[PDB]
Write a protein that binds this ligand. Structure first.
Ligand SMILES: Oc1c(-n2ccnn2)cnn1-c1cc(N2CCOCC2)ncn1
Ligand SMILES: [Cl-]
Ligand SMILES: [Cl-]
Ligand SMILES: [Cl-]
Ligand SMILES: [Mn+2]
Length: 204
């Protein structure tokens, strides 16, 4: 589907019904591999003589295709104009470009935004080519609040994931046995983000 059709026919009704939406084959193989090359360049540096996080705006040298990813995410969110709950999405974070070690470590269950920090939608893009979660792990488990079911989401290559960032979606990540990368972006609700910012002295 084109971005308009995908947003209105799939992403919007999926998010309002479930709070979780998976889009597969988001950018295609060639672009996905290019993003992987850029991400590995950021994190796979050598040496002279937890996890790794970098925050990317999208116009840094060697990050142009990460920027294309962010523009593509922005395109989908824009076409959701005012249809994602009651939110008015007026901005987002930088891209969190993460490298997660394959050392048998998982991520404890948590809520991204538990206390009204302004973030209403979490977007995650998975860029590890030919990742087989059945063999290598790394599955995301989301527990939508009050539902009888929970969801396991495999970090499949070129997969885009949306979910509500607030207490509706506690989530945990199972351990993995190879290095993997994911890029996360959070979209802000205008009113909540404004309220969260009033406490600061001109300091964001
Ligand atoms: O890194 C992840 C994963 N994950 C792990 C492996 N695969 N996916 C799932 N949530 N999550 C995360 C990270 C985060 N940070 C990271 C440290 O800086 C501050 C903000 N804030 C909220 N959620
Ligand atoms: Cl939790
Ligand atoms: Cl966290
Ligand atoms: Cl902000
Ligand atoms: Mn999280």
């Amino acid at each position: 589907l084109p971005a308009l059709k995908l947003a209105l026919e799939y992403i919007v009704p999926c998010m309002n019904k479930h709070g979780i939406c998976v889009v597969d084959d988001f950018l295609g193989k060639e672009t996905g591999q290019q993003i992987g090359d850029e991400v590995r360049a950021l994190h796979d540096t050598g040496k002279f003589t937890g996890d790794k996080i970098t925050w990317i705006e999208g116009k840094e040298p060697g990050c142009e295709t990460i920027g294309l990813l962010m523009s593509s995410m922005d395109d989908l969110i824009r076409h959701c104009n005012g249809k994602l709950g009651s939110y008015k999405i007026n901005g987002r974070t930088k891209a969190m470009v993460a490298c997660y070690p394959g050392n048998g470590t998982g991520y404890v269950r948590h809520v991204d935004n538990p206390n009204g920090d302004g973030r209403c939608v979490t977007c995650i893009y998975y860029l590890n080519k030919d990742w087989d979660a059945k063999v290598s792990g790394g599955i995301l488990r989301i527990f939508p609040e009050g539902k009888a079911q929970f969801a396991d989401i495999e970090p499949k290559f070129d997969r885009l994931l949306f979910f509500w960032s607030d207490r509706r979606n506690p989530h945990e990540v199972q351990p993995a046995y190879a290095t993997r990368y994911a890029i996360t972006v959070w979209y802000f609700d205008a009113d909540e983000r404004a309220r969260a910012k009033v406490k600061y002295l001109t300091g964001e």
